[PDB]
Amino acid sequence: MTIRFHRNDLPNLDNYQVDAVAIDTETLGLNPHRDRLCVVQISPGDGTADVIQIEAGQKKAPNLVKLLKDRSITKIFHFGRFDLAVLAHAFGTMPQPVFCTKIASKLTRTYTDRHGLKEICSELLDVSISKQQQSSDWAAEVLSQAQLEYAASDVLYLHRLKAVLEQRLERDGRTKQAEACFKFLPTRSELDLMGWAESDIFAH
Amino acid sequence: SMTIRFHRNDLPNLDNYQVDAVAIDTETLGLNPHRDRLCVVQISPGDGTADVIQIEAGQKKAPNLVKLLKDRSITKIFHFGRFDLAVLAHAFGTMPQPVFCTKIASKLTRTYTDRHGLKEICSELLDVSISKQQQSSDWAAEVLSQAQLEYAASDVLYLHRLKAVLEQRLERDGRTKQAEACFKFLPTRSELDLMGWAESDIFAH
Amino acid sequence: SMTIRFHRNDLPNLDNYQVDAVAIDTETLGLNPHRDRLCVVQISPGDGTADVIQIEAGQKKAPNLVKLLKDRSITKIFHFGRFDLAVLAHAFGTMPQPVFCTKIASKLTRTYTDRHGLKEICSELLDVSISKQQQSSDWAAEVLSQAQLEYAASDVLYLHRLKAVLEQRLERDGRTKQAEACFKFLPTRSELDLMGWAESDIFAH
Amino acid sequence: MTIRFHRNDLPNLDNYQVDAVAIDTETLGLNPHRDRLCVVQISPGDGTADVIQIEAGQKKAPNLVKLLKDRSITKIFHFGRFDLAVLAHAFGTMPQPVFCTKIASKLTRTYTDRHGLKEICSELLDVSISKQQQSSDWAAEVLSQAQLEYAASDVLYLHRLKAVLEQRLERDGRTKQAEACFKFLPTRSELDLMGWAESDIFAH
Amino acid sequence: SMTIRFHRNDLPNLDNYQVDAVAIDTETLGLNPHRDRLCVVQISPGDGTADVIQIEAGQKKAPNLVKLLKDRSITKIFHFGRFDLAVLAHAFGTMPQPVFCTKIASKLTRTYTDRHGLKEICSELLDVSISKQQQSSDWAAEVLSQAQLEYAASDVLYLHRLKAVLEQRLERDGRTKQAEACFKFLPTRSELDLMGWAESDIFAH
Amino acid sequence: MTIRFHRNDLPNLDNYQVDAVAIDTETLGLNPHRDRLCVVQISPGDGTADVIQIEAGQKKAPNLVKLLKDRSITKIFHFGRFDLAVLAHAFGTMPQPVFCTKIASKLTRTYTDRHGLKEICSELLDVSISKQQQSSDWAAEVLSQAQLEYAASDVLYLHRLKAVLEQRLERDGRTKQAEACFKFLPTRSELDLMGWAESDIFAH
Amino acid sequence: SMTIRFHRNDLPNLDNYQVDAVAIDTETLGLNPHRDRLCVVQISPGDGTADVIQIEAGQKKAPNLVKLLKDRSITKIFHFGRFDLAVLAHAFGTMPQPVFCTKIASKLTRTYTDRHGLKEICSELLDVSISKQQQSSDWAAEVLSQAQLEYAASDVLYLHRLKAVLEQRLERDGRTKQAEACFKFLPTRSELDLMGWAESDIFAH
Amino acid sequence: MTIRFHRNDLPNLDNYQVDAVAIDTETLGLNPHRDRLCVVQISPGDGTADVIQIEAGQKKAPNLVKLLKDRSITKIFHFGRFDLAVLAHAFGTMPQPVFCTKIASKLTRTYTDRHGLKEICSELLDVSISKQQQSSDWAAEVLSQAQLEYAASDVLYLHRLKAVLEQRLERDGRTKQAEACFKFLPTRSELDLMGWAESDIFAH
């Protein structure tokens, strides 16, 4: 497991001369206004990962933000709706464009209600990772090796999941609808930050 | 009279529709577009008049209406947008765009209430009285009554005026861009309903 | 008057019942056929008149009524079919057939509403006003009031007219064969209720 | 396990000179209008099974359809309400007459709320099979040996279950009511396709 | 007037209570007997008159009332039996018995309804109009209004008449013995509420 | 395990010169009007049990009924509300007087919501039995040794449970209330047969 | 008239507020203080008059009002205390204290009801008629109508009178100290709502 | 495990010359008016515990009550809302001031809904204890060694949990709000005894 650890930000973009990046975050909980960003994990898709410890009160991360702003780079998430809100709230940039493997799973894996990251890693790639846990204080001053490996596992496979899901979207005729969902997803996250996190804006 | 113009099948021409936005609603046999056929299309150019078009069973074409639905320079205004877009696309094969939905705009501006129905916003924003949506009409009946024509017309006669108020409120409260993104997605939301996700929020965790 | 004919125990003969379809309802002491006895049978031949028959406690026979229930050439029309078939079979030992149920027919045609009660369909389809089903009558009382006779009669006076409208709608919307299969199954649905499955949908996954 | 694999259709009816056949299907999910038919599995009741891979867009299966139409052949299902809708939607013929082991179980095994196929195979026959899973993309171009065996297991025991359930229906006095349920079941499936899949048509 | 007699603390004597059954209700500060004190006891001998007794804060004794509660030759009739028995036992130390509860009797006879409130049965069985139970009175107030005295009296003025009707119906429908066993258990049901099982059905599986 | 098997009825009351008997039943399910009585199991409290197979349509069991009618003999149940209804429906006699170990548990074991027979056997006596199962067709013509042992286990310990629960009722001051519950229980079962099985008659 | 005084932004001075307790309510764009801005502050000194203060978008200061909110010698009386304290602290940076909440006091005294709204207690305790809280006003509108000023004033004109009654009842029923502890905690309850626990009971098991 | 067992009360306060004590109780169940106090367990925070068996009808415990009344001694609980009500009901003194580790957990461990004592002992201290059980009659005349050890485990770690939680409250900026919750908690328990145990007094 090739994991590069950083404080605050990537040191440069030497490993990020790519057209897509895989991103996840760790926080103090599910409420972005209450629960601060603690870790950003990111992978170029080459089987390596960067795990970035974010300090309390940290307002800037310029190299990461360059990637988030770069419209030629697709930001891949599984927890897209959540992570986009957390990243926009932390550093002021709503990342775009995006691909969400959970939305893509919902639009292709029509035979199940299980769309978690552990499930799709196992089913689509035969890769074993941990489910999302509730046992870590991610604001701890020192993150353990186990925590770095957990964080890295959440981004090491997103490019490969996206490739499979793209094939299935084309096979079953839903590529254009998925793309429209991805175009809307940054707004869905903005609406969550604005005060509609518990409302489906499209409900009757 | 002059307020309501009744037609069979389609608009007769587009003389009244040389406009930048039209207001649309539909009447059907119920809430399931695959089971419940389109029965009426009601449309207004925003001038205080309305066209009420009776749609026949099995009707696959309505070329003049469809020109308006396809015309990207004309905004199609709805209150029941998610539903009506699915019904219209299923009936005639064109997903209307671009759109403005007064229900979504109400949800993003009238933050002090959970009541976003058409009767409520007509009364609150315009002091206009209309009927709530009813469950008492067989809209596939051979003969539509004058009361039914008036009910259908009332659902489109005020949408331009509501849109004007709601646009001002979206700008005042800083939500114009988010509303526009919702309107851009709405045709896909309706497509997903027709495809089999009508009971699912695609953005749920 | 001439509209309502009151009887004890049974019809006196079948002079008014030389017909191809009869309309039937019942009054009981409540919703549980094993606990709550049959108290009234109301029946109409479809000519704007009704017979209201007071049933005694412990009554096991009603031969003239039962001839009609058994006669396969006479369709028994109900609105409360699932319930009334169970009550009648439990009381007199004959499961009536064949049947037409206006509630099932309403569910298969009035696809724009969730309101399928008898008062609603009488008003909507016929412009006829009747009372909704009430919870204020001890139907086992020794004396039935004129108001009670009128209420019971109103539940059967309009079923032929409702059936005519609903048959037309089933044909219009293409569901005649499915409705007929529901009517064929309904006596078994009522038998299953009496057997102990009253709270279970036998077709559930 | 004698499994005969086929593409599209049975090649002939040489193995189907019988009075009853056992049928199940695999699909992309629970919504017949969205989720296509992917596999038809069928057994003559002799301890063998045919597993038929159905192509995307496939409109015909003439030998299978002959069996579905043949009124002298009872079609046995456990998932009857679902499979009848799927088969009618795929090929245009509503199979009849039918026997449903789940309905028969509900009418005889009055001491339990567990009416799944795995449960009744174990209880009535002491046979072990897998429960219905949510881990298979049945639209995959190549089905695995494990998938063929899973599909075959769903039809290999239905004749034997029907024989036991018929004895219990007669013992407890419910044969005629069960038969009326089987006569109505094709209509129940038609009503599902027509738009009433979430409604009990007999509710008050 | 002569219909309502108002008293402080207790009945003045038992001149009006040389009877075989009395009708009782209470008013309190709410539904929790440990928190919400007894404020009024209303009682009638069944002759169309009622005594309304204001109970003081901290009152532990009411000897004349308590003689009636203890007297096993006098049936205490309630509609709100489960509640009032707990309140009275908590206030004065005597669990009243024997009892007849018109609500339980209604549940065992009026099998055609889920409405077993006092206003409903007064109207249906006697054609008597009273108020439903209200939530607008501070019954611990220093001064009780004439309207409050009339409300309290109305809750006991009709219980003998209801009991007579309900006894006849219990006999007609064959449930007298089961009702009597319910009445025998009711004081224990009230004791169990005071002991800490107020939210539990002790007979649940 | 001393188990005496019988068809239809006890042959005599030689083992029942006692002041209390422990009783349970097996049936085709939870609805006494639909689901017939199949087994009566009974113990004198001496570590032995009688298991009585009841035939379809059986209307009499005179020796058992003598015990049910005998007012000098307490009938002990754990499933009292159910078993009393089943026995009264089968043979025409509502047993009395009774003691119910489930009611007694609810009135003493105030620290738990678990009042099943397996739980109280383990907690009060350190005895291990099976929980109530849903896998047996109790109307089968031949009951297995395992079924006889299961049925016997349900009555072998009720006298001992009653003795413990009586001590706890006296310790915590609830003997009189429990006795009133036991006096009412036959009526509660009658009301179930009469049509109130789903209603708490004491509800507001 | 003299009953309602209208102001922009703040009170003009504190001539009417040389008092030991003030009554306060607010109007906003909705229930979420982070999304829905403060639009009106209404305040009364308890003399049958009220000040209604229109708050501008983006307003961060209201120095005269804030002096009252900060003054520990002045009790701030609310009915909607938990909400209004959060709104006021979010708007101007001061958490008002000390406080008296008539809703909490009602819950601790009116133990016979689950209705603790302002309209209900005004009617029951004072025989005063006001409107319930409405969902029909855009309180951020440029122009507030006379009817809106009257509605806002009615929410503060009676709080001193309600507090007087409720204080007497708290003493009568022995709950003064517990109520005071609730009032002391209430500002923290409002802070916890703003911090992200608005949907959580912090004292739940 | 250093456990000192006592009947009725501490014999003296020789082990309690401390500024904070850790307390829990065992009872006959969750309703303080119905279910009597059976055990008080208390620790000075030095790795020892006192387990005090409380008799039926016991009205006094003067040495324990001295600690409960002493305003210079913080009473630490995990089950604070419950234990405060039980102690006040038993002996007449509402303990104050208090610290509740469950409230402190809710205000710091924002990434989880699991705030039980077993969970926080494991996560914050790597200490293993049993969860709260429902298998003990705590009114038994003789408590077992296992019961004494269970009771002691509930107080041996509360001082250490409080120290960790205080650090987290300061780190995340919630010390003052937590202190106000602790000041209100005795009133919350009084309101439970008064008749509001099922109501959130702050609800709209």
Author numbering:
A (entry chain A), D (entry chain A), F (entry chain A), H (entry chain A): 1 to 204
B (entry chain B), C (entry chain B), E (entry chain B), G (entry chain B): 0 to 204
Give the article text.
Orn and NrnC are 3′–5′ exonucleases with a DnaQ fold containing the catalytic DEDD motif, a domain that is common in enzymes that act on nucleic acids. Notably, Orn (and its eukaryotic ortholog REXO2) or NrnC activity is critical for cellular growth, rendering them unique amongst the exoribonucleases known to date. Through quantitative structure-function analyses, we show here that NrnC-type RNases share this narrow substrate length preference with Orn. The structures confirm an octameric assembly as a conserved feature of NrnC-type RNases.
To further understand the structural basis of NrnC’s substrate preference, we determined structures of B. melitensis NrnC (NrnCBm) in several apo and partially pGG-bound states. (C) Superposition of four apo-NrnCBm conformations based on three independent crystal forms (comprising chains apo1A/apo1B for form 1; apo2A/apo2B for form 2, and apo3A/pGG-bound3B for form 3), compared to the pGG-bound conformation of the same protein shown in (B). In a second apo-NrnCBm crystal form, we captured an alternate conformation in which the conserved hydrophobic residue F79 moves into the active site. The movement of this residue, which is adjacent to the phosphate cap residue H78, is realized through a flip of the peptide backbone and would introduce a clash with the nucleotide. In the same structure, the flexible SKQQQS loop is collapsed into the active site, trapping the catalytic residue Y150 in an intermediate conformation, which would introduce further clashes with the nucleotide substrate. Simultaneously, a rotamer change of the phosphate-cap residue H204 pivots its sidechain away from the active site, opening it for access to substrates. This conformation may depict a post-hydrolysis state, suggesting a mechanism for product release.
